[PDB]
Design a protein around this ligand. Structure first.
Ligand SMILES: O=C(Nc1cccc(-c2nnn[nH]2)c1)c1cccc(F)c1
Ligand SMILES: O=C(Nc1cccc(-c2nnn[nH]2)c1)c1cccc(F)c1
Length: 259
């Protein structure tokens, strides 16, 4: 039923849809193209922020560390970082800016703090994600070229990792709480997964988009039942395709009605 509905949605959308649900009530999973690779785009910002949080477990002052923002550091979407040019932002501010505003300059500073895109991948491997790969910095990590393995993961792997980070023991308790607080404070998510969920439910999420009309969202959801983790990835055959947040909302609604 749910599988057929997601297939119909995908067909009418003209693109390629990837879905992974984990229901933590009983570990049930719903997968649609769960093991195909998709470009993560800004959903990768969660892994970068989480890695810096992991570093902060052994450097308790790390989130207070100032980082210089120079004019040359500004890239293509810098809603927070542009205010601090020729000044500084703390690693906490950079994490919040990347997660809650999807600031690309902020993400680049997180990547640099981790020793480059490979440092983000190394953290993923350390927590048991063998699928995630970050290869590039912003903005080129969002090129989303069909068939390109760079900066991709699978819906199954990202759902598992998001669960470990937000509901499991990948991070210390304080760090896990901070990540959840940041995600719940996202400003960019109302039109995506959360648009397809009952209004009484609470959630945190991280969106992403790129070329090929790539439109992504990953969410942790608190419904009268145990939390859910939901990943919805979507990408289209033409480089200049329009974003389709409505497709993510539709996939989420199909999932929610199928519960
Ligand atoms: O894997 C990483 N850190 C990590 C992973 C798992 C456990 C721990 C740890 N911290 N204190 N004890 N163990 C650290 C990591 C963090 C930042 C950058 C990087 F490349 C790797
Ligand atoms: O950087 C890009 N997009 C971008 C930048 C900042 C935030 C987001 C975003 N989309 N949904 N959440 N965040 C997307 C980008 C778009 C097209 C091609 C490209 F190379 C990069």
């Amino acid at each position: 039923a749910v599988q057929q509905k997601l297939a119909a949605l995908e067909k009418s959308s003209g693109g390629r849809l990837g879905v992974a649900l984990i229901d933590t009530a009983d570990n049930t999973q719903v997968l649609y193209r769960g093991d195909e690779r998709f470009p993560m785009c800004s959903t990768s910002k969660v892994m970068a922020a989480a890695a810096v949080l992991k570093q902060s477990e052994t450097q308790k002052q790390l989130l207070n560390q100032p980082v210089e923002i120079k004019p040359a550091d500004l890239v293509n979407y810098n809603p927070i970082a542009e205010k601090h040019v020729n000044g500084t932002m703390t690693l906490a501010e950079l994490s919040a800016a990347a997660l809650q505003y999807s600031d690309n300059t902020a993400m680049n500073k997180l990547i640099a703090q981790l020793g480059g895109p490979g440092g983000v991948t190394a953290f993923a491997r350390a927590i048991g994600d063998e699928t995630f790969r970050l290869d590039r910095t912003e903005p080129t990590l969002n090129t989303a070229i069909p068939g390109d393995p760079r900066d991709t993961t699978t819906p199954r792997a990202m759902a598992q990792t998001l669960r470990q980070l937000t509901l499991g023991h990948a991070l210390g308790e304080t760090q896990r709480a901070q990540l959840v607080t940041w995600l719940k404070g996202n400003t960019t998510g109302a039109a995506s997964i959360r648009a397809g969920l009952p209004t009484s439910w609470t959630a945190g999420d991280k969106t992403g988009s790129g070329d090929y009309g790539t439109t992504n969202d990953i969410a942790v959801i608190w419904p009268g039942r145990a939390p859910l983790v939901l990943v919805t990835y979507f990408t289209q055959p033409q480089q200049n395709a329009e974003s389709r947040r409505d497709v993510l909302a539709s996939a989420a609604r199909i999932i929610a009605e199928g519960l």
